[PDB]
Design a protein around this motif. Sequence first.
Motif, short mmCIF file in Angstrom:
data_model
loop_
_atom_site.label_atom_id
_atom_site.label_comp_id
_atom_site.label_asym_id
_atom_site.label_seq_id
_atom_site.Cartn_x
_atom_site.Cartn_y
_atom_site.Cartn_z
N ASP A 5 6.56 4.57 -12.52
CA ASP A 5 7.51 5.05 -13.42
C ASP A 5 8.66 5.74 -12.76
N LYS A 6 8.39 6.48 -11.66
CA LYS A 6 9.45 7.17 -10.98
C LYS A 6 10.24 6.20 -10.10
N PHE A 7 9.52 5.17 -9.53
CA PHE A 7 10.14 4.14 -8.67
C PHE A 7 11.07 3.39 -9.45
N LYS A 8 10.62 2.98 -10.62
CA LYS A 8 11.39 2.26 -11.58
C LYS A 8 12.47 3.07 -12.12
N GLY A 9 12.23 4.30 -12.33
CA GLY A 9 13.20 5.14 -12.83
C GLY A 9 14.41 5.16 -11.92
N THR A 10 14.16 5.17 -10.62
CA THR A 10 15.20 5.15 -9.63
C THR A 10 15.81 3.70 -9.37
N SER A 11 14.93 2.68 -9.23
CA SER A 11 15.35 1.30 -8.86
C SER A 11 15.39 0.24 -10.01
N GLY A 12 14.69 0.50 -11.10
CA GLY A 12 14.62 -0.42 -12.23
C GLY A 12 13.64 -1.58 -11.96
N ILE A 13 12.68 -1.35 -11.05
CA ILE A 13 11.72 -2.41 -10.65
C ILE A 13 10.30 -2.20 -11.13
N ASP A 14 9.76 -3.24 -11.76
CA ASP A 14 8.39 -3.27 -12.25
C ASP A 14 7.37 -3.57 -11.15
N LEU A 15 6.91 -2.53 -10.46
CA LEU A 15 5.95 -2.70 -9.36
C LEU A 15 4.62 -3.29 -9.74
N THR A 16 4.31 -3.29 -11.02
CA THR A 16 3.06 -3.85 -11.51
C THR A 16 3.01 -5.32 -11.42
N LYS A 17 4.13 -5.94 -11.16
CA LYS A 17 4.19 -7.37 -11.02
C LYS A 17 3.91 -7.83 -9.62
N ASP A 18 3.86 -6.91 -8.66
CA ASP A 18 3.54 -7.25 -7.28
C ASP A 18 2.22 -6.66 -6.89
N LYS A 19 1.22 -7.51 -6.74
CA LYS A 19 -0.12 -7.11 -6.44
C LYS A 19 -0.28 -6.32 -5.17
N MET A 20 0.58 -6.57 -4.18
CA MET A 20 0.46 -5.88 -2.91
C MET A 20 1.05 -4.50 -3.07
N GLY B 13 6.75 -16.35 8.10
CA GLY B 13 5.33 -16.39 8.33
C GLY B 13 4.77 -14.93 8.38
N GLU B 14 5.59 -14.01 8.92
CA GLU B 14 5.20 -12.61 8.98
C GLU B 14 5.18 -11.95 7.61
N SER B 15 6.08 -12.38 6.70
CA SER B 15 6.08 -11.78 5.35
C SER B 15 4.85 -12.24 4.57
N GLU B 16 4.38 -13.43 4.90
CA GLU B 16 3.17 -13.94 4.31
C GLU B 16 2.05 -13.10 4.72
N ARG B 17 1.98 -12.82 6.02
CA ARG B 17 0.98 -12.00 6.57
C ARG B 17 0.99 -10.60 6.00
N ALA B 18 2.20 -10.01 5.81
CA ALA B 18 2.30 -8.63 5.24
C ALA B 18 1.67 -8.63 3.88
N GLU B 19 1.90 -9.70 3.11
CA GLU B 19 1.29 -9.80 1.78
C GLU B 19 -0.25 -10.02 1.93
N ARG B 20 -0.67 -10.77 2.96
CA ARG B 20 -2.12 -10.96 3.23
C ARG B 20 -2.82 -9.61 3.57
N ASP B 21 -2.09 -8.76 4.29
CA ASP B 21 -2.59 -7.48 4.75
C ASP B 21 -2.27 -6.35 3.80
N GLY B 22 -1.43 -6.60 2.81
CA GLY B 22 -1.08 -5.56 1.86
C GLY B 22 -0.20 -4.49 2.51
N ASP B 23 0.57 -4.86 3.52
CA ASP B 23 1.46 -3.88 4.21
C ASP B 23 2.82 -3.79 3.57
N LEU B 24 3.01 -2.80 2.67
CA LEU B 24 4.28 -2.68 1.96
C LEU B 24 5.45 -2.37 2.88
#
Lengths: 148, 88
Positions: A5-20, B13-24
């Motif tokens: 909510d705060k991230f979005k509040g600042t950037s307007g991005i729905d982080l829930t859509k990115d699993k990582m 290929g590295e961005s794939e890996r970051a997503e594989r590793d969950g490294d934001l």
Amino acid sequence: DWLVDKFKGTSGIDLTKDKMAMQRLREAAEKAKIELSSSQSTSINLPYITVDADKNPLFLDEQLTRAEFQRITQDLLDRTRKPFQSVIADTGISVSEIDHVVLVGGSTRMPAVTDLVKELTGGKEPNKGVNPDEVVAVGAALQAGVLK
Amino acid sequence: VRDLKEQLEALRGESERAERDGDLAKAAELRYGRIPEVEKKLDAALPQVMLKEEVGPDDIADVVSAWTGIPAGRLLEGETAKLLRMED
């Protein structure tokens, strides 16, 4: 949720859509709670999380105070009061008649929970010395020796 | 150009890996930092005629010109001056 909510509040991005984004947000949250079990403040640092429209650097940099944490989580802490009371009521035993309190589950390490317990039990002090998550296992081990 | 393509792809290929590793920290750093950075560099060099790599519509004409002696080309930037000074 707060972080999003705060991230979005600042950037307007729905982080829930990115699993990582969401997995490290959970790691950060876990540790944020842990830090707030003793600290009055904790810092969340997840740089370059995901991608916005302008490819701008999105660094999640948030300060979660223990007070804010309670403002948020007390919606859930309050849910515990009713069942605590329902056991008390079902037995007909006041808190003054309780000889000993045992807290188990790591979340009981929080001061928000501890203080709630203090209200709940009339100040009757929970026994510390065994890690709340491990407590049960400890007892079991003991019964395994007693039993055999 | 080629080098830039290779570099780009490595980052992808590295961005794939970051997503594989969950490294934001590196996940989007790669996905909207390093990858589009090299992509843009590539694109800037990308426009880079002579011996492209395929038989265009004028190599056939040049073969036909060697044949039969009849010249049917495109006025290749040197003859278009003689065909202007023809009168003089």
